[PDB]
């Protein structure tokens, strides 16, 4: 280095590029690093958080679809990002979701989170903010491993309450037992007294591409029984119908270690981050059941939700 | 024999050899002796005691304890660092361990880790290595959160396999049940397959400053009775006598989720990083039982370990 | 215009550009606009205020202050490091200047040094650099022992030219005699030919904490009269008022063995390294008089230098 | 590095080489360093002090010559090193003088030193010891620069009092003035209260090879007038004749800033380190004058001294 950590190098290049408008080359020899190191870092900055880009306009998202999704479902916060065929769904939403959370979260506040590419991608772009604002995290469901992608790529000086059990027990009785263990029971309480919550939303229409199945928490065959039973999607493993009600005919619901949906309702602000048109139905059903009262999605999915 | 006796000749060559740095041949003709005679005398020199090379450094004490620990205990690898004599004794324990682990772990191997301050502090310095060499990590016991300050300070793209359950269950039965959940059992098998293991060692003489007791896994009353029943130290919750034998009449043991010390021994290389004179007896017993076969400790402790 | 107005188009391209990282051309056809129209709107974006890039780091403030000091005072090189908010303000001031000196000194060049804690602390980090690049050192004033903590921490095969006399003489006449001894006058000439100069800056408001007074070159009684006479700070024993003018009615000046501030100015690059909010006044004055044209300081001091 | 400083790497190789007898190659791979870096450090160790070689024999030096030099001149300590034609004389003596001082010096004691290659080479071999034993240093004469070869190559945490003036003034008036400045006067007192003293010895017979002249402290022309005026050699600038008496007819003696020979005798142990056959006369004279009561020289000069 040059007596300065990378963080300071990013800020120095960010400053020369944006505030002094210098070619990514002029600043190469200016800071004493290869033309390739320069640009390497610039991108490093945006991805990290050091470099924040502000779009001050009511058109940051899809203004119309937002106003409509807001009224139709009575949502306290809604963000519909511009569509872009063929792209990581969760990676784009994560960006949007991060920004939204950066304005609803107050210093030293509790943030409940659920697994999935959508939320874990948000956690990643939200790492920086969690540090400074000193946000405390707490997992809404069991699983552990399924949370590593998000909390892992974070600072080690942050408070992260992790439910110490699997996401699903082999039997309903074993689930009751673990929920009574002090280590578990403790975090379930912690989770329910959270200020903001961020969860994903799975669809039964996703078949074998649903994070729930490709992670091995539910079998392909069990998925069928669930669809047949009239279920559209899920949240943390709890499945519901197109009207927004938990199908109380599914075996898994009593083997899930982790706050049941009725209990998640206690969190003031509940953000759902999901995209894709095959989710359109499950997302509408989650806003119906009142499981979420804020939503981060993409244009296509917004159109699909509003249409049907 | 230019009027010189052997003793004088020996001192003459020793001076020229070490203080003047002359080749054993340059000294041959300088003293009027055959090149074969000069070398024989130099040899005689050390053999007699006339010539003695002594290492003038604090590190010498460490080197010494390293060989005595290697002789007395059958240790494959040993590393003794300066004691309280120098700054930050605990901090340096992690640096040492981290480097011993770097010379033992090959690209893409499996590393089983234990909880504790020494293990997590070591785990952090080893962040760099773990990423660059694609090391895989697996937790030896339950606890989940107990590992966060270490794996938390790590790369997110790296494989980290954790046991999704408490460190301890409320009863031996609930423990046995948890040990049979596939999501749990999977990681216990993975654990035993590790190539290298890194663990800390707790001491009963540590009283309440003990991490096992400070973290609330064991009550002060339990720790006193454990000490009464002959235990002197512990590794992952399993207590043993100064002989090295796991104490049998201890309830906590069957309530522990995680590999028993016996299985731990299947791992080829087992590194124990522990410092502080109060751990002397326990560390010693840990080796007599064969729980570890590699040790990283500080000068003062080594002294005590070898004393008694 | 796919039904979109300017403001909405700008937000859309801004989103694709920064949050999705698409080429100025890939978003050209995505929005159905000419490749030249795309870039035109992006430009308009920042120029309007709809698009704003802000650096989220503690270092932001520093770069800000570096800019302001640069404009307000004629500074060739400036470095502002975080203040007391961060650990070791004094320690880090040495690191900074050390690096500033490394980008200014070419192999085999002459470096004139002043005494003081900041200068000696800087002179120590720069030990590596001085050797490897064959830097020559020369002292700006008498004191001899006053430099040992710095040059002492250096290689012995390095060229170090020291003034063979006291920092201050008992009378103006003894000083003038000493300044005439060839063995002395020679180091004074060499000092004036240096390429780079590094000095500290004392403040009268430092009272008894001032290095000049702690080292016993000046009595408390003299310091008070000097302040009473308009002096705000000093460099190498020569005092000056807030304007930058060397105070003339001060007796100590004509007793000083060593180059006068005026001669210091012949040195191309003059770097002053000073931290601590109480030197603010003096530092500022040192620049208004042009005794230094490069500055390395802390955030808080910079702030105060700029306030008043 | 391998997590260990160089000091620790030297001790590890010294240990393998001498206490475990392993080829300079087998220890290359053992510490993970180039076969060339191994040997680099090995000899780096001897040079520094970390590797001390002990020669426990009455013949470490030239026994006969020492017993004779001791008795004829009544010396407290005497060391005569083995002769070796064509060699850095001061560099060999330095090793000898070093070891002698290491046994004469008790912790925290003050050592007065004079300039010259002999003393400066001793100071360099003594650096290590001066640090641990925490020996305080003080210059017997002015000069400052002429002492940098020795004190420079030392740690920066040790006490070193330096007479802040030239070795010689341009006039006797100027010389008395300097000897009366508080900072000079003080060090002169510190000098006289020293426990041990180590100085060199110049000989008139050295012509233009005498450090006294090749450093420009005295003109070769002035040298002759001193020779003709009947002087054999000098110590710190003070000239004397074959019998051991200061020629009171020399002008320089009154222009020298620094403890006069008379004052130098106040110091308990006064070791003179000098070699070469052309000094044999000057050295003998200094022992008769009583200036030194200890001597470290080499075999040939020893015989030279005893012959005439
Ligand atoms: O990866 P994603 O599809 O965005 O997330 C879907 C999962 O997270 C949701 O809350 C449901 O529990 C699903 O299992
Ligand atoms: O924090 P430390 O004292 O270094 O670690 C001691 C604990 O970790 C060890 O593996 C044992 O399980 C102890 O309970
Ligand atoms: O120790 P510091 O306060 O940083 O240095 C200030 C002193 O050194 C400066 O050149 C001035 O001569 C002061 O006497
Ligand atoms: O470098 P060396 O010849 O060994 O030292 C000789 C000098 O030091 C002696 O005390 C005399 O003062 C000479 O000036």
Helices (H), chain B: 6-14, 26-31, 35-48, 59-72, 89-102, 117-125, 127-132, 148-151, 172-178, 182-192, 211-214, 220-228, 261-264, 280-288, 299-307
| Contact C148/D at CB under 8 A | yes
CA–CA gap between residue C165 and residue D16 (Å, rounded): 50
Helices (H), chain C: 6-14, 26-30, 35-48, 59-72, 89-102, 117-125, 127-132, 148-151, 172-178, 182-192, 211-214, 220-228, 261-264, 280-288, 299-307
Please name the residues between 95 and 114 in chain C that touch chain A, using a CB distance below 8 Å: 95-96, 98-99, 102-103
| Contact B11/D at CB under 8 A | yes
Instruction: Find all residues with CB under 8 Å of D229, minimum gap 6, and list them.
Output: D247, D249, D250
C20: alpha, beta or left, given left = phi > 0 and alpha = psi -120 to 50? alpha
Ligand 3 pocket at CB < 6 A: C 114-118, 199-202, 211-212, 234-237, 274
Q: Indicate if A109 and A205 belong to the same structural domain.
A: yes
CA–CA gap between residue D113 and residue D120 (Å, rounded): 9
Measured in whole angstroms, how far is the alpha carbon of residue A25 from the centre of its chain?
Answer: 37
Tell me if A136 sits within 8 A of A111, measured CB to CB: yes
Tell me if B268 sits within 8 A of B31, measured CB to CB: no
Token pair listed for A72: 């139709």
- SS3 sequence of chain A: CCCCCHHHHHHHHHHHHHHCCCCCCCCCCCCCCCHHHHHHHHHHHHHHCCEEEEECCCCCCCHHHHHHHHHHHCCCEEEEECCCCCCCHHHHHHHHHHHHHHHHCCCCCEEEECCCHHHHHHHHHHHHHHHHCCCEEEECECCHHHHHHHHHCCCCCCCEECCCCCCECCCHHHHHHHHCCHHHHHHHHHHHCCCEEEECCEEHHHHHHCCCCCCCCCCHHHHHHHHHCCCCEEECCEEECCCCCECCCCCHHHCECECCHHHHCCCCEEEEECCCCCCHHHHHHHHHCCCCCEEEEEHHHHHHHHHC
Q: Indicate if C196 and C213 belong to the same structural domain.
A: yes
CATH number of the domain within which C67 lies:
3.40.50.1360
Tell me if A119 sits within 8 A of A142, measured CB to CB: no
Say how many domains are in chain D.
2
Instruction: Find all residues with CB under 8 Å of C140, minimum gap 6, and list them.
Output: C112, C113, C114, C191, C197, C199, C236, C258, C259, C264
CA–CA gap between residue A198 and residue A114 (Å, rounded): 6
Comparing CA positions, the residue from C72, C93, C69 lying closest to residue C83 is: C93
Q: Indicate if D2 and D73 belong to the same structural domain.
A: no
CA–CA gap between residue B130 and residue B154 (Å, rounded): 8
Tell me if B150 sits within 8 A of B137, measured CB to CB: no
Ligand 4 atom at shortest distance from the alpha carbon of D116: 1
Q: Indicate if A11 and A94 belong to the same structural domain.
A: no
Task: Determine the distance in angstroms separating the CA of C153 from the nearest CA of chain D, rounded to an integer.
Answer: 5
CA–CA gap between residue B53 and residue D306 (Å, rounded): 34
* Closest Cβ opposite residue C162 in set D145, D155, D184: D145
Token pair listed for D44: 């780096």
Chains D and A touch (3+ CB pairs under 8 A): no
Q: Do residue C8 and residue A52 have CB atoms under 8 angstroms apart? A: no
From chain B, pick out residues whose CB is under 8 angstroms from the CB of D59. 7-8, 11-12
Tell me if A302 sits within 8 A of A80, measured CB to CB: yes
| Contact C302/A at CB under 8 A | no
Token pair listed for A273: 């981050």
Helices (H), chain D: 6-14, 26-30, 35-48, 63-73, 89-104, 117-132, 148-152, 172-178, 182-192, 211-214, 220-228, 261-264, 280-288, 299-307
| Contact C155/A at CB under 8 A | no
| Contact A248/C at CB under 8 A | no
Q: Indicate if A79 and A45 belong to the same structural domain.
A: no
Tell me if D283 sits within 8 A of D301, measured CB to CB: yes
The beta-carbon contacts of C182-185 under 8 Å, at least 24 apart in sequence, are C182/D170, C183/D166, C184/C257, C184/D166
Comparing CA positions, the residue from A130, A11, A1, A154 lying closest to residue C57 is: A11
Instruction: Find all residues with CB under 8 Å of D35, minimum gap 6, and list them.
Output: D24, D25, D28
Tell me if B202 sits within 8 A of B196, measured CB to CB: no
Task: Please count the residue pairs, one from chain A and one from chain C, whose beta carbons lie less than 8 angstroms apart.
Answer: 84
Tell me if D82 sits within 8 A of D61, measured CB to CB: yes
Token pair listed for C268: 């191309």
**HSE on the CB side for A93, CA within 13 Å?**
28
Q: Indicate if A116 and A39 belong to the same structural domain.
A: no
Q: Indicate if A127 and A256 belong to the same structural domain.
A: yes
Token pair listed for D237: 């600038």
- Report which protein residue has its CA nearest ligand 1's atom 12: A236
The radius of gyration of chain B from alpha carbons, rounded to an integer in Å, stands at: 25
CA–CA gap between residue C291 and residue A1 (Å, rounded): 30
Distance (Å) of CA D304 to CA C28, D231, D278, D296: 97, 18, 9, 14
CA–CA gap between residue C242 and residue C231 (Å, rounded): 7
Tell me if D126 sits within 8 A of D101, measured CB to CB: yes
From chain D, pick out residues whose CB is under 8 angstroms from the CB of C182. 170
The radius of gyration of chain C from alpha carbons, rounded to an integer in Å, stands at: 25
Tell me if C212 sits within 8 A of C141, measured CB to CB: no
Burial of C21 (0-12, 13-18, 19+ CB in 10 A): exposed
Instruction: State the DSSP code for C201.
Output: -
Q: Indicate if B92 and B207 belong to the same structural domain.
A: yes
Task: Determine the distance in angstroms separating the CA of D295 from the nearest CA of chain B, rounded to an integer.
Answer: 19
Comparing CA positions, the residue from A161, A165, A160 lying closest to residue A180 is: A165
Burial of A157 (0-12, 13-18, 19+ CB in 10 A): exposed
Cross-strand pairs, D141: D258
For chain A, the maximum distance between any two Cα atoms, rounded to a whole number of angstroms, is 67
Collapsing DSSP states into helix, strand and coil, what is residue C203? strand
Q: How many helices (H) and strands (E) does chain B have?
A: 15, 11
CA–CA gap between residue A295 and residue A73 (Å, rounded): 10
Residue C80: which H helix or E strand, with range? strand C77-81
> Which residues constitute the domain of residue D184?
55-308
Burial of D162 (0-12, 13-18, 19+ CB in 10 A): buried
CA–CA gap between residue D13 and residue D74 (Å, rounded): 44
Residue that has been written with the tokens 């919750």 in this structure: B237
CATH number of the domain within which D9 lies:
1.10.10.10
Tell me if A52 sits within 8 A of C14, measured CB to CB: no
Could you tell me which chains touch chain A, where touching means 3 or more CB pairs under 8 A? B, C
Q: Indicate if D165 and D202 belong to the same structural domain.
A: yes
Token pair listed for A93: 């939403």
Comparing CA positions, the residue from C237, C240, C252, C233 lying closest to residue C301 is: C233
Q: Indicate if B37 and B83 belong to the same structural domain.
A: no
Comparing CA positions, the residue from D230, D82, C62, C186 lying closest to residue B11 is: D82
**HSE on the CB side for C279, CA within 13 Å?**
26
Comparing CA positions, the residue from C252, C289, C291, C277 lying closest to residue C84 is: C277
Distance separating the N- and C-terminal Cα atoms of chain D: 57
Q: DSSP states of B85-104 as a string?
A: TSS-HHHHHHHHHHHHHHTT
CA–CA gap between residue C65 and residue B257 (Å, rounded): 56
From chain C, pick out residues whose CB is under 8 angstroms from the CB of D174. 177, 181
Measured in whole angstroms, how far is the alpha carbon of residue B170 from the centre of its chain?
Answer: 32
| Contact C158/D at CB under 8 A | yes
Of the residues B13, B36, B51, the one at which a domain ends: B51
Q: Indicate if C6 and C35 belong to the same structural domain.
A: yes
CA–CA gap between residue C167 and residue C211 (Å, rounded): 13
Cross-strand pairs, A246: A240
Tell me if A162 sits within 8 A of A154, measured CB to CB: no
Resolution in angstroms, to 1 decimal, for this deposition? 2.6
For chain D, the maximum distance between any two Cα atoms, rounded to a whole number of angstroms, is 67
Token pair listed for B197: 């293991």
Q: Indicate if D34 and D172 belong to the same structural domain.
A: no
Token pair listed for D25: 């190659």
């Amino acid at each position: 280095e040059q007596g300065m950590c990378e963080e300071e190098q990013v800020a120095r290049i960010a400053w020369f590029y944006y505030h002094d408008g210098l070619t990514q080359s002029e600043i190469s020899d200016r800071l004493g690093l290869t033309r390739l190191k320069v640009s390497r870092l610039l991108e490093k900055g945006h991805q990290s958080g050091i470099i924040r880009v502000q779009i001050n306009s009511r058109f940051e998202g899809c203004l119309e679809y937002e106003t409509q999704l807001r009224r139709q479902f009575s949502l306290q916060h809604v963000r519909v990002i511009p569509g872009l065929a063929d792209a990581d769904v969760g990676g784009r939403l994560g960006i949007g979701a991060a920004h939204m959370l950066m304005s609803l979260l107050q210093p030293q506040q509790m943030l409940a989170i659920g697994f999935g590419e959508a939320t874990m991608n948000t956690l990643q772009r939200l790492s920086g903010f969690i540090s400074s604002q000193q946000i405390r995290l707490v997992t809404l469901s069991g699983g552990v491993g399924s949370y590593m992608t998000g909390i892992g790529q974070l600072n080690a000086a942050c408070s992260v309450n992790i439910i110490p059990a699997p996401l699903r027990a082999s039997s309903a009785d074993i689930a009751r037992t673990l929920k009574n263990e002090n280590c578990v029971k403790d975090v379930l309480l912690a989770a329910q007294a959270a200020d903001v919550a961020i969860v994903g939303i799975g669809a039964v229409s996703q078949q074998d591409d649903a994070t729930i199945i490709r992670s091995g928490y539910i079998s392909q065959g069990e998925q069928l029984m669930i669809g047949r039973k009239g279920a559209v999607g899920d949240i943390l493993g709890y499945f519901f119908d197109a009207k927004g009600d938990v199908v109380t005919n599914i075996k898994i619901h009593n083997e899930l270690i982790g706050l049941p949906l009725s209990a998640l309702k206690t969190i003031p602000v509940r953000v759902g981050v999901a995209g894709g048109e095959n989710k359109a139905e499950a997302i509408a059903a989650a806003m119906k059941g009142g499981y979420i009262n804020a939503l981060v999605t993409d244009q296509d999915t917004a159109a699909a939700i509003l249409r049907s």
